[PDB]
Amino acid sequence: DVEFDALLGSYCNTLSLVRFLELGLSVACVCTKFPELAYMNEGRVQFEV
Amino acid sequence: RDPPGYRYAAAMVPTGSILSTIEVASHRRLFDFFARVRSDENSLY
């Protein structure tokens, strides 16, 4: 007798890495990187009209 | 909490331009300092 058992193959999804900049909702924001955000403590935007 | 106050110098060199023109002061407290001046005030100098 010959009797074996087979591995009929492996399937692995690759989780897609989605950036934020490529997306619809990144028009509704102005995103900027600010390395010193950790130190800022208080920030403000003035607004004259 | 005695919030901040508008920085006059920083004005004069805007970092942008507000497109919407509307009567502000309805949306009063969206800001923690709102000042409405009329022809001009004493407090800007």
Coordinates of C-alpha atoms in Angstrom, one line a residue:
Chain A
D1 CA 0.0 0.0 0.0
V2 CA 0.8 3.6 -0.6
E3 CA -1.3 6.2 1.3
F4 CA -0.3 9.9 1.6
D5 CA -1.8 13.1 2.6
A6 CA -1.6 16.3 0.7
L7 CA -1.1 20.0 1.4
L8 CA -3.2 21.4 -1.4
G9 CA -1.8 24.9 -0.9
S10 CA -1.8 27.9 1.3
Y11 CA -3.7 31.1 0.9
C12 CA -2.7 34.2 2.7
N13 CA -4.3 37.6 2.2
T14 CA -2.0 40.6 2.0
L15 CA -3.7 43.4 4.0
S16 CA -3.7 46.3 1.7
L17 CA -1.9 49.3 3.1
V18 CA -4.1 52.4 2.5
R19 CA -2.5 55.8 2.7
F20 CA -4.7 58.6 3.8
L21 CA -3.6 61.0 1.1
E22 CA -5.0 58.7 -1.6
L23 CA -8.6 58.9 -0.5
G24 CA -11.6 61.2 -0.8
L25 CA -11.7 62.6 2.6
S26 CA -8.2 64.1 2.5
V27 CA -9.6 67.1 0.5
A28 CA -11.7 68.1 3.6
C29 CA -8.5 68.6 5.6
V30 CA -5.2 70.4 5.3
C31 CA -2.8 67.9 6.8
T32 CA 0.7 69.0 7.8
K33 CA 3.4 67.2 9.7
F34 CA 4.7 69.1 12.7
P35 CA 7.5 67.2 14.5
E36 CA 7.4 69.4 17.6
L37 CA 3.7 68.9 18.2
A38 CA 4.8 67.0 21.3
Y39 CA 6.3 70.2 22.8
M40 CA 3.8 72.7 21.7
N41 CA 1.5 72.9 24.6
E42 CA -0.9 75.6 23.1
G43 CA -1.5 76.5 19.5
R44 CA -3.9 78.9 17.9
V45 CA -5.0 80.3 14.6
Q46 CA -6.1 84.0 14.6
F47 CA -8.7 84.6 11.8
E48 CA -9.4 88.3 10.9
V49 CA -12.3 89.2 8.7
Chain B
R1 CA -9.9 81.3 31.6
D2 CA -9.0 84.7 30.3
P3 CA -8.3 83.2 26.9
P4 CA -5.6 84.4 24.5
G5 CA -5.9 87.6 22.5
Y6 CA -5.6 88.6 18.9
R7 CA -2.1 89.1 17.8
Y8 CA -2.1 92.2 15.7
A9 CA 1.4 92.1 14.2
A10 CA 0.9 88.5 13.0
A11 CA -2.0 89.9 11.1
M12 CA -0.6 92.1 8.3
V13 CA 1.0 89.0 6.9
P14 CA -1.8 86.5 6.6
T15 CA -1.1 82.8 6.0
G16 CA -4.3 82.5 4.0
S17 CA -7.5 84.1 2.9
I18 CA -11.0 83.3 4.2
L19 CA -13.2 82.8 1.2
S20 CA -16.6 83.0 2.9
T21 CA -17.7 86.5 3.7
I22 CA -20.5 86.4 6.2
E23 CA -21.7 88.3 9.1
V24 CA -19.6 86.8 11.8
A25 CA -20.6 87.4 15.4
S26 CA -23.5 85.0 15.1
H27 CA -20.9 82.3 15.5
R28 CA -19.8 84.0 18.5
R29 CA -18.1 81.5 20.8
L30 CA -16.6 79.2 18.1
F31 CA -13.6 81.3 19.1
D32 CA -12.2 81.9 22.5
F33 CA -11.4 85.5 21.6
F34 CA -13.9 87.4 19.5
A35 CA -13.8 91.1 19.3
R36 CA -15.9 93.1 17.1
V37 CA -14.6 96.5 16.3
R38 CA -16.6 99.1 14.4
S39 CA -14.9 101.9 12.5
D40 CA -11.8 101.2 14.6
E41 CA -10.9 100.9 18.3
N42 CA -8.3 102.2 20.7
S43 CA -7.2 98.7 21.4
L44 CA -5.4 97.8 18.2
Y45 CA -2.4 100.1 18.7

